[PDB]
Write a protein that binds this DNA or RNA. Structure first.
Lengths: 102, 94, 186
RNA sequence: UAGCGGCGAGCGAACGGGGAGCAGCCCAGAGCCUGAAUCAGUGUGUGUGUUAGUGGAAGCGUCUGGAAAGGCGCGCGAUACAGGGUGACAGCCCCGUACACAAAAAUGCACAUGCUGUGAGCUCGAUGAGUAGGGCGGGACACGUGGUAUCCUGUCUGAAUAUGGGGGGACCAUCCUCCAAGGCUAAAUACUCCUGACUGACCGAUAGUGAACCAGUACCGUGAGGGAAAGGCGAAAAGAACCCCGGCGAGGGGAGUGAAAAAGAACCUGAAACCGUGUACGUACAAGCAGUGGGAGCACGCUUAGGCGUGUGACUGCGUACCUUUUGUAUAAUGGGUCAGCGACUUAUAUUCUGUAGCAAGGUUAACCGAAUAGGGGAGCCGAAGGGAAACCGAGUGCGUUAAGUUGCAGGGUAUAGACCCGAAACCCGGUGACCGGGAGAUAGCU
């Protein structure tokens, strides 16, 4: 299931992020993904004397299920699903809606 | 219309449950008359499976109301059957 | 009585006593409950103090973590039904269905190809949404393209389940299927 | 059930037919020609399953809305609307899903196989030689070796082998079966330590395996053995930065995160008994199952008085708890501290009766087959024409006559299974130095 890979534009579908797009930083084993500036969190950082703590609130990014996000086809300007086919050399993923090839 | 079907009245009873609830109360003539070869004789009795398996004794005992004019041969025939079976037109002889 | 196919005006005569008998509520109740009991699966058991891990009494059911005073071994709830009673129930249910005009008959209900879209379009033309489809000889083109439809079922004459006739509001017959069911039921 | 049975409790046939497959062979040995059927091993190839796996259809706006999968409106796929995950219920968000494919190797199974080993087919001998049987000294069948069938054995006799010898019926005669005393035979017959899937009108935590929780753990016992209680924050730790007090702890408060902090880690909802605070009432001159009918008074809403409701009850007539056996009882027969949870007449086979459903002088299927609740299957069982022991009578014989019984469902009874539940002492086996597990939820009486 390599539908979502690294360095790809994805748009959320459900939950506090309808419409907003972003770039996937990476993916996790459980399927959760990280996209910059999509679900901001105000996590509080416990004061640690060592490790050179910057100090204060830290604005990091939380984890969002892959289901809530889908690859956005900028060519058609609309969210669409993906499929797989065999080419001469290897296998690559292609969008739906007339089968745009990446 | 599955939720429109009920059983007959009086066919279901919950039954008693002692304790629970203080206020809850507490060979003949008719035989082998027509069996496709029901001739009165000692043979075929075992095959027909009408009188046990090891039963050999046979009799044509009757109780009035003669309704099967069947002729009897090969069995114990006496004057008694003469006055009863013949009333229906049948013949009885040894 | 004569039933009009409403497609070719080829009504087929049927025995009056078969589709004209009075609706016997008790017989249908008995057959339905017998079938439901037969559907039961005998999978249930527990351990008594005799067969409860431990030693002794501590294992007595009154004591906590003990056995069950009223343990029941697995059993089968199915009960046999007389063949004549089953035939009478089938005749009564068929008579009741035809009396209220919930039974539909056509000369032949077949699909040229195993395409669910064609079947859905045909059903829409028939103005039927949740109905029972029953015919004679099995058709792969129709049977294959009917499983996905939960509210649409296709079977053969030998598999006429009496309870199934109640779940579906309407039943669709076939010219050969009617004759087959009439001759087999007798 | 025939039978057995102190003819008592109780114990317990055979034949026949219906079902799955049915196989009888080889040696005691030679003649003709062959390694021709078959049975095993060694290597090629084909197909069919496993150990990784691939492809595999389809959606959006508005509203409540923490977040939509929910309502509304309009579309699409379906040989796939089985399941699972996804901030609330998903065919069209994702893994799967029916369907089509995939192996260098290990490998199981079927085949043409070359080679390596016994071995085609017909002919006519051959019926298993200290073998039966008998007998002596002993042991087992209610039984002190007894009339002792029959078996075990240290030892002695002992014929035939289709001109033949055993067994059975017959009083004897007659009549029927085999080749006894040398070997082999997958097949249909029962079950699960484990493995994949599937199904639960089974359980959801005092239940369900003892254990959903790091359980056969802690713990008890030198010893064998016994044996627990204990799982749920939040969609996402986004786990309270920071400030104040406190002892630079614990416990906290404010702010912030978080829908929610009546989600703060001991983290869903959080009962009763129990424990404290505030609110309104009564009680410091009054005697007893502490309640009940009336009831003035006191405080709050209300008919914005109207005699209305709620909260308390100065006084008044009456007023000796709950379960059991006992004629009956706190009386001096009998037991209970409270709360939450746990716990009690079902089921298996027979027999009797009622209601209910058809069929009906017929009713009715078992096993099994089976497109597996269909249908087949008439094996089988019950009843439909008197009873008197039999004989023999035969609407006739003190007893009866033409009315009708069977099969499913539910219920009311009886017997056998421990069958409404709880509660002994003793005995045996196998172990541990008196104790442990089993017979045994033992057994009879009585609470």
């Amino acid at each position: 299931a390599a539908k979502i890979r690294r360095d790809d534009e994805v748009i959320v579908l459900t939950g506090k992020d309808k419409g907003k797009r972003g770039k996937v930083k990476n993916v996790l084993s459980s399927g959760k993904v990280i996209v910059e500036g999509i679900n901001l969190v105000k996590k509080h950082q416990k004061p640690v004397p060592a490790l050179n703590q910057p100090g204060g609130i830290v604005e990091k990014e939380a984890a969002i299920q892959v289901s809530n996000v889908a690859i956005f086809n900028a060519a058609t300007g609309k969210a669409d699903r993906v499929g797989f086919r065999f080419e001469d050399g290897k296998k690559v993923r292609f969008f739906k809606s007339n089968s745009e090839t990446i | 219309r599955l939720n429109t079907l009920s059983p007959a009245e009086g066919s279901k009873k919950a039954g008693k449950r002692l304790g629970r609830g203080i206020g809850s109360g507490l060979i003949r003539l008719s035989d082998l008359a027509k069996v496709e070869g029901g001739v009165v004789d000692l043979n075929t009795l075992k095959a027909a499976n009408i009188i046990g398996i090891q039963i050999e004794f046979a009799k044509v005992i009757l109780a009035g109301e003669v309704t099967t004019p069947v002729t009897v041969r090969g069995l114990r025939v006496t004057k008694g059957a003469r006055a009863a079976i013949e009333a229906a037109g049948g013949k009885i002889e040894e | 009585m004569e039933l009009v196919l409403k497609d070719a005006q080829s009504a087929l005569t049927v025995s009056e006593t078969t589709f004209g008998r009075d609706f016997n509520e008790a017989l249908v109740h008995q057959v339905v409950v017998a079938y439901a009991a037969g559907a039961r699966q005998g999978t249930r058991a527990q351990k008594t103090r005799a067969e409860v891990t431990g030693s002794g009494s501590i294992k007595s059911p009154i004591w906590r973590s003990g056995g069950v005073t009223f343990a029941a071994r697995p059993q089968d709830h199915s009960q046999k039904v007389n063949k004549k009673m089953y035939r009478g129930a089938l005749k009564s249910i068929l008579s009741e269905l035809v009396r209220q005009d919930r039974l539909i008959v056509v000369e032949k209900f077949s699909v040229e190809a195993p395409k669910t879209k064609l079947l859905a379009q045909k059903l829409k033309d028939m103005a039927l949404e949740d109905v029972l489809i029953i015919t004679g000889e099995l058709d792969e083109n129709l049977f294959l393209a009917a499983r996905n439809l939960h509210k649409v079922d296709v079977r053969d004459a030998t598999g006429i389940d009496p309870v199934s006739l109640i779940a579906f509001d309407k039943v669709v017959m076939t010219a050969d299927a009617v004759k087959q069911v009439e001759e087999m039921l007798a």
